[PDB]
Design a protein around this ligand. Structure first.
Ligand SMILES: CCCCCCCCCCCCCCCCCC(=O)OC[C@H](CO[C@@H]1O[C@H](CO[C@H]2O[C@H](CO)[C@H](O)[C@H](O)[C@H]2O)[C@H](O)[C@H](O)[C@H]1O)OC(=O)CCCCCCCCCCCCCCCCC
Ligand SMILES: CCCCCCCCCCCCCCCCCC(=O)OC[C@H](CO[C@@H]1O[C@H](CO[C@H]2O[C@H](CO)[C@H](O)[C@H](O)[C@H]2O)[C@H](O)[C@H](O)[C@H]1O)OC(=O)CCCCCCCCCCCCCCCCC
Ligand code: CLA
Ligand code: CLA
Ligand SMILES: CC(=O)O[C@H]1CC(C)(C)C(=C=C/C(C)=C/C=C/C=C/C=C(C)/C=C2C=C(/C=C/[C@@]34O[C@]3(C)C[C@@H](O)CC4(C)C)C(=O)O/2)[C@](C)(O)C1
Ligand SMILES: CC(=O)O[C@H]1CC(C)(C)C(=C=C/C(C)=C/C=C/C=C/C=C(C)/C=C2C=C(/C=C/[C@@]34O[C@]3(C)C[C@@H](O)CC4(C)C)C(=O)O/2)[C@](C)(O)C1
Ligand SMILES: CC(=O)O[C@H]1CC(C)(C)C(=C=C/C(C)=C/C=C/C=C/C=C(C)/C=C2C=C(/C=C/[C@@]34O[C@]3(C)C[C@@H](O)CC4(C)C)C(=O)O/2)[C@](C)(O)C1
Ligand SMILES: CC(=O)O[C@H]1CC(C)(C)C(=C=C/C(C)=C/C=C/C=C/C=C(C)/C=C2C=C(/C=C/[C@@]34O[C@]3(C)C[C@@H](O)CC4(C)C)C(=O)O/2)[C@](C)(O)C1
Ligand SMILES: CC(=O)O[C@H]1CC(C)(C)C(=C=C/C(C)=C/C=C/C=C/C=C(C)/C=C2C=C(/C=C/[C@@]34O[C@]3(C)C[C@@H](O)CC4(C)C)C(=O)O/2)[C@](C)(O)C1
Ligand SMILES: CC(=O)O[C@H]1CC(C)(C)C(=C=C/C(C)=C/C=C/C=C/C=C(C)/C=C2C=C(/C=C/[C@@]34O[C@]3(C)C[C@@H](O)CC4(C)C)C(=O)O/2)[C@](C)(O)C1
Ligand SMILES: [Mg+2]
Length: 317
């Protein structure tokens, strides 16, 4: 069909550019994500809120296929030093995304183009690192794909219904109560350790990072999609309640709702696979020591006890 053929053309046009891109290093993308909120923290937080809302307008079946496609492509990418997928897996990632975007609310989706801060300076840097004639040809093929997708769009008509707690519920409230005082002292619009990790982590061990991403997607595919939708919406609500507060500190009720929603979503994952993510990413132990070093020692240790308690309640459910 129209999408399939346009996607094919887009894939053809972009694969050669993709082959020259530094997927695993500290590219202009790694540095842009790392510093994006430094400029306008509120705009960055609102953008994330819009990103999740758009995701909430999509057809879960197509979201799932799109994620499956990335996981399958990682299987081939994570074996070579360039983290470069096969032309086959690559073309399949694009067609799955084209179909998933066809199910999204059109206006909300198109609005993501201008939602993130300074995405224009990033795009200019990405172009400067590509062959200009090549990227131009790719962009014209991208436009033709967007039209095929727009023409085929169901405009969010399959958005999932979203709702809007025995031992789990109780253990989550204690966890919330013990972590809120730690959360409320941090500046979520300026988190030095996390930014530095995002900026430099992959470059140090690209293969392990691609594997970590892959395992994470893999774990996500074992979760109950309605629970995924609930947790995602819980965060959309939290952010709205956090946007005007210094440091983007969540409101107490929103924060609790997020932890409960996550607890439930994690209860639905493959346990060994979820558990294993703890050691899946490169440099995570060192990242956690640095995050811990920024917190009140006492309160964090006290919180860890509630964290272990919640982990058990969830395992029993
Ligand atoms: C990770 C684990 C799980 C996490 C969960 C999931 C997270 C998922 C991701 C979230 C992040 C996405 C957020 C939105 C980003 C917005 C990007 C976008 O708005 O981007 C929008 C841009 C289009 O930008 C627009 O481009 C326009 C260009 O037109 C300009 O030039 C035109 C030329 O015809 C005309 O001259 C026109 O008049 C002139 O204005 C204008 O500049 C606009 O202002 C500008 O907004 O998209 C384009 O550039 C498309 C690219 C063009 C192709 C050129 C290079 C090819 C790229 C190769 C890379 C290999 C990968 C395959 C390809 C993948 C696609 C990149
Ligand atoms: C775009 C749409 C989709 C977005 C999706 C992306 C989501 C983003 C991340 C998801 C991906 C997860 C994958 C990697 C796991 C990273 C988190 C992890 O490493 O998480 C686990 C980490 C590290 O694990 C701990 O690691 C420790 C390591 O210490 C051990 O080893 C150490 C040396 O490494 C020392 O030697 C030490 O003595 C020894 O005890 C221990 O092993 C612990 O048992 C083990 O639990 O800890 C814990 O986080 C427990 C903390 C308890 C409370 C302490 C205060 C927390 C307050 C936070 C602020 C409020 C918010 C609450 C949020 C909840 C915060 C938990
Ligand atoms: C696994 C590796 C992977 C990689 C390397 C890419 C790479 C890319 N994606 Mg794909 N994508 C992936 C996974 C991946 N994707 C997954 C799993 C999905 C779900 C199906 C998608 C869905 C998707 C869509 C729908 C689109 C892309 C697009 C893009 C391109 C532009 C991205 C960009 O704007 O950067 C710069 C980044 C930004 C401007 C904003 C990033 C905001 C982040 C994600 C917020 C994170 C918040 C989170 C809480 C942080 C946690 C941090 C942690 C350390 C604690 C780029 C080629 C877009 C594109 O091609 O546009 C032209 C596009 O339309 N991606
Ligand atoms: C919007 C803001 C937001 C923020 C500030 C956070 C922040 C956090 N979350 Mg939450 N989360 C969010 C949204 C958010 N989350 C959403 C929408 C969901 C889905 C419902 C989740 C689901 C989630 C779960 C299920 C868990 C967390 C965890 C955590 C903590 C991770 C700590 C760490 O050191 O990771 C270090 C991170 C890594 C080693 C690897 C991160 C890999 C992800 C996929 C990176 C994605 C973004 C990255 C830049 C790539 C962009 C790609 C794109 C350009 C294509 C941290 C407190 C974890 C936690 O609390 O553990 C105790 C946890 O268990 N989050
Ligand atoms: C419930 C749940 O599961 O939620 C999870 C679901 C997921 C999928 C896993 C998930 C995710 C990822 C998401 C939402 C990604 C969203 C990406 C959006 C990208 C949007 C883009 C690029 C938009 C545009 C618009 C453009 C317009 C271009 C043109 O107008 C221009 C300038 C000039 C015209 O002449 C031609 C034109 C061409 C018309 C463009 O060029 O680009 C997340 C975040 O994890 C949440
Ligand atoms: C916890 C953690 O660390 O997670 C890690 C997870 C990962 C996945 C490992 C990770 C990563 C890597 C990522 C996302 C890489 C993303 C790469 C994106 C490449 C995008 C490209 C090339 C975009 C374009 C757009 C172009 C536009 C060009 C033009 O518009 C320009 C200017 C001018 C117009 O007139 C003509 C034009 C030609 C139209 C262009 O030419 O190219 C990261 C960052 O390490 C974080
Ligand atoms: C670290 C690491 O491992 O990296 C490796 C990871 C992988 C995954 C293995 C890998 C790979 C593959 C990758 C990244 C593929 C990325 C593909 C991105 C595709 C993006 C697409 C199609 C975006 C759009 C946006 C569109 C917007 C359309 C509309 O908005 C428009 C305009 C107008 C609205 O009115 C209607 C609309 C219809 C809403 C659209 O139609 O399409 C690689 C290369 O190997 C690197
Ligand atoms: C820029 C901006 O806006 O920032 C703002 C954005 C927000 C969203 C508004 C915001 C906020 C709130 C946030 C971040 C809340 C984060 C909550 C995270 C909760 C994480 C949890 C519960 C993680 C787990 C992990 C578990 C693992 C369990 C198991 O694996 C274990 C051990 C053993 C296995 O065998 C069994 C298992 C059961 C599998 C578990 O059971 O639970 C804030 C602070 O306001 C900042
Ligand atoms: C189809 C689709 O929509 O997919 C999308 C769906 C989402 C949700 C949007 C999405 C997402 C996000 C995902 C999956 C996040 C996953 C996070 C996983 C975190 C895992 C953690 C923290 C695991 C652990 C394990 C630990 C173990 C601790 C202990 O063992 C230790 C050491 C010592 C024991 O004595 C006590 C103990 C306490 C037992 C721990 O401490 O932490 C994504 C990526 O966008 C894909
Ligand atoms: C394009 C764009 O806009 O991207 C931007 C999007 C956003 C959302 C705006 C954004 C953001 C912000 C983000 C994700 C913030 C994340 C904050 C995470 C905080 C995590 C914390 C506190 C973790 C912990 C873990 C701890 C563990 C402590 C211990 O285990 C330790 C060590 C040792 C044990 O013996 C004892 C222990 C006590 C158990 C701890 O004490 O604390 C960003 C970065 O700007 C990018
Ligand atoms: Mg895989």
């Amino acid at each position: 069909d129209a999408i399939a053929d346009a996607s094919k053309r887009f894939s053809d046009a972009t694969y050669p550019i993709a082959e020259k891109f530094d997927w695993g290093g500290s590219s202009a993308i790694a540095k842009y994500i790392a510093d994006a909120s430094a400029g306008n923290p509120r705009q960055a937080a609102l953008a994330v809120e819009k990103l999740l809302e758009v995701g909430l307008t999509m057809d879960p079946k197509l979201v799932r296929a799109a994620v499956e496609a990335h996981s399958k492509a990682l299987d081939s990418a994570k074996k070579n030093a360039k983290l470069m997928a096969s032309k086959e897996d690559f073309a399949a990632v694009n067609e799955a995304l084209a179909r998933m975007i066809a199910s999204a609310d059109k206006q909300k989706f198109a609005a993501l183009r201008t939602a993130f801060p300074e995405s224009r300076e990033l795009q200019g840097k990405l172009f400067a690192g590509n062959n200009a004639f090549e990227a131009e040809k790719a962009y014209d093929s991208f436009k033709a794909l967007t039209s095929a997708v727009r023409d085929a769009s169901i405009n969010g008509a399959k958005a999932p219904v979203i709702a809007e707690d025995g031992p789990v519920g109780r253990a989550a409230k204690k966890f919330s109560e013990a972590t809120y005082p730690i959360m409320d002292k941090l500046d979520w619009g300026k988190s030095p350790e996390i930014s530095k990790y995002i900026e430099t982590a992959s470059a140090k061990n690209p293969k392990m990072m691609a594997d970590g991403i892959d395992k994470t997607l893999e774990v996500a595919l074992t979760m109950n999609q309605n629970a995924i939708n609930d947790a995602v919406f819980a965060h959309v609500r939290a952010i709205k309640g956090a946007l005007n507060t210094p440091g983007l500190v969540a409101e107490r009720d929103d924060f609790a709702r997020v932890n409960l929603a996550l607890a439930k979503m994690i209860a639905t994952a493959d346990p060994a696979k979820f558990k294993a993510l703890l050691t899946a990413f490169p440099g995570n132990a060192d990242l956690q020591m640095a995050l811990f070093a920024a917190n009140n020692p006492e309160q964090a240790k006290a919180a860890y006890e509630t964290f272990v308690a919640l982990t058990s309640a969830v395992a029993s459910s």
